[PDB]
Amino acid sequence: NIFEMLRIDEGLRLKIYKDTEGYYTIGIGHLLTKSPSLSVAKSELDKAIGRNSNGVITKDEAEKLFNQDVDAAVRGILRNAKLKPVYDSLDAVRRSALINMVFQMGETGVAGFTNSLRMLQQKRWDEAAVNLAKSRWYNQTPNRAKRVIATFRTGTWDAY
Amino acid sequence: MEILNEEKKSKVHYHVAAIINYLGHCISLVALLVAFVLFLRARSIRCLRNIIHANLIAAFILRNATWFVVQLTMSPEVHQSNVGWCRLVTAAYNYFHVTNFFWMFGEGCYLHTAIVLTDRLRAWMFICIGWGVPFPIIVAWAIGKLYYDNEKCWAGKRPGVYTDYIYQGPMALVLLINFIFLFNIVRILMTKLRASTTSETIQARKAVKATLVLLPLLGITYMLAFVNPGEDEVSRVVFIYFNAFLESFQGFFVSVFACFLNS
Numbered sequence: 001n002i003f004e005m006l007r008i009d010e011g012l013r014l015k016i017y018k019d020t021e022g023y024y025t026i027g028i029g030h031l032l033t034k035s036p037s038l039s040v041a042k043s044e045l046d047k048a049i050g051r052n053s054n055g056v057i058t059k060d061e062a063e064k065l066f067n068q069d070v071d072a073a074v075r076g077i078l079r080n081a082k083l084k085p086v087y088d089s090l091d092a093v094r095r096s097a098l099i100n101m102v103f104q105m106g107e108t109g110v111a112g113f114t115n116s117l118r119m120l121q122q123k124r125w126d127e128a129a130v131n132l133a134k135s136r137w138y139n140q141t142p143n144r145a146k147r148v149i150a151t152f153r154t155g156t157w158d159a160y
Numbered sequence: 161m162e163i164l165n166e167e168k169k170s171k172v173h174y175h176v177a178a179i180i181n182y183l184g185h186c187i188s189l190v191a192l193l194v195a196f197v198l199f200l201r202a203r204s205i206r207c208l209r210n211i212i213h214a215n216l217i218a219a220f221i222l223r224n225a226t227w228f229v230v231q232l233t234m235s236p237e238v239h240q241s242n243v244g245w246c247r248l249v250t251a252a253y254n255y256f257h258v259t260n261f262f263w264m265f266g267e268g269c270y271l272h273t274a275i276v277l278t279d280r281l282r283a284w285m286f287i288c289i290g291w292g293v294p295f296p297i298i299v300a301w302a303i304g305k306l307y308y309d310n311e312k313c314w315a316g317k318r319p320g321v322y323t324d325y326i327y328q329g330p331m332a333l334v335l336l337i338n339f340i341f342l343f344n345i346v347r348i349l350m351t352k353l354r355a356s357t358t359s360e361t362i363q364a365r366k367a368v369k370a371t372l373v374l375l376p377l378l379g380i381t382y383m384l385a386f387v388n389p390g391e392d393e394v395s396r397v398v399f400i401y402f403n404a405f406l407e408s409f410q411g412f413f414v415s416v417f418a419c420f421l422n423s
């Protein structure tokens with residue numbers, strides 16, 4: 001379900017587009033190359049896609065790129081000493097909510113939520129939610145934040 | 161003469177069919193209602209999968225319920241008056257008939273998506289397909305009834321009018337697409353996912369078996385409508401009895417189908 005989750009929260013684009021800083025990206029936020037040259041961007045695509053390298057990709061192609069990025073996210077999570085123990089103590093639904101957060105704010109952002117992180121490792125889920133909501137994150141993207149917290153509180157997909 | 165005795169014999173056999181049809185509809189309505197309350201009681205109601213089962217069951221309860229009121233429009237006096245509530249009851253019944261098709265289509269959309277893309281928000285797509293798309297089709301059919309066939313409470317059958325195609329052709333199309341879905345699910349499950357043991361995979365295989373069981377059971381009655389069997393007394397008695405059993409127990413079959421999948 002993780003693929004549909006990020007897709008509601010971030011969006012899906014099937015052709016090459018340029019981000020606010022101007023690099024070339026595709027899928028659920030997959031950066032190809034920072035070069036201003038599209039050729040290098042498209043070719044970086046050809047190797048991953050293993051097909052005719054074109055601007056448009058299949059929805060299926062999106063999920064393999066997405067999956068590659070999900071590996072990279074878990075690899076970062078395991079390297080961080082504050083993130084690794086909470087991830088190992090968590091079920092599969094709650095792990096996705098952590099990965100969701102890493103997609104949005106990076107590994108360094110999540111490590112700052114020190115109290116909520118211990119509440120989660122102690123399965124004190126009601127208190128984790130109050131701590132998470134008292135943040136600037138909650139105020140800047142509230143509807144996404146309410147979904148991710150809800151997943152933490154109940155361990156279900158019910159919100160997405 | 162004895163022709164009259166032949167006519168009296170037919171009425172008795174038609175009257176037996178009517179008891180088959182009423183009793184079947186009563187049993188089916190009760191079975192669906194029990195399944196509905198069981199689905200709602202469980203905390204698994206918040207899964208997208210159970211939301212779809214619950215709406216499907218609800219759709220069948222309304223159709224089976226309005227079938228009784230339709231019976232009160234089949235009096236010859238009412239059939240010919242074409243009064244307003246006459247036509248409203250027929251149109252509500254066709255609408256529910258159409259929702260039944262689109263909700264069975266919705267189930268096929270879920271099973272195809274579940275095995276290919278890894279709940280309360282996504283449901284709106286299925287509610288809009290199951291409940292919302294049929295409404296304008298029925299309105300369009302109604303405008304066509306109002307304008308080319310305003311007779312017999314819109315339940316008339318006359319050769320050369322194709323108004324009912326407005327709603328019947330959409331029905332056939334979603335069944336065509338559901339057959340394409342079933343071939344890909346079977347192909348996907350047989351080639352890839354042959355060794356897969358994910359929860360979605362086990363449930364998908366349970367679905368494919370049940371769907372294969374149900375497809376013959378529901379299909380005979382749809383073809384039997386086109387049979388035009390004949391005047392053999394033995395052929396007539398069984399044809400009418402067997403078909404009445406099959407149409408009237410359809411809701412019961414769908415309620416076993418949904419409960420089984422819940423496991």
Ligand SMILES: COc1cc(Br)cc(OC)c1[C@@H]1C(C)=N[n+]2c1nc(C)nc2N(CCCC(F)(F)F)CCCC(F)(F)F
Binds near residue numbers: 268339345375380382
């Ligand atoms: C493909 O199939 C399929 C597939 C899948 Br993946 C899934 C499913 O479900 C889950 C399904 C199904 C069935 C089993 N049936 N169905 C359908 N779907 C549709 C759309 N439709 C129908 N129908 C019958 C058929 C029959 C024949 F024989 F014709 F076939 C109609 C009627 C409906 C009501 F409700 F009204 F009854």
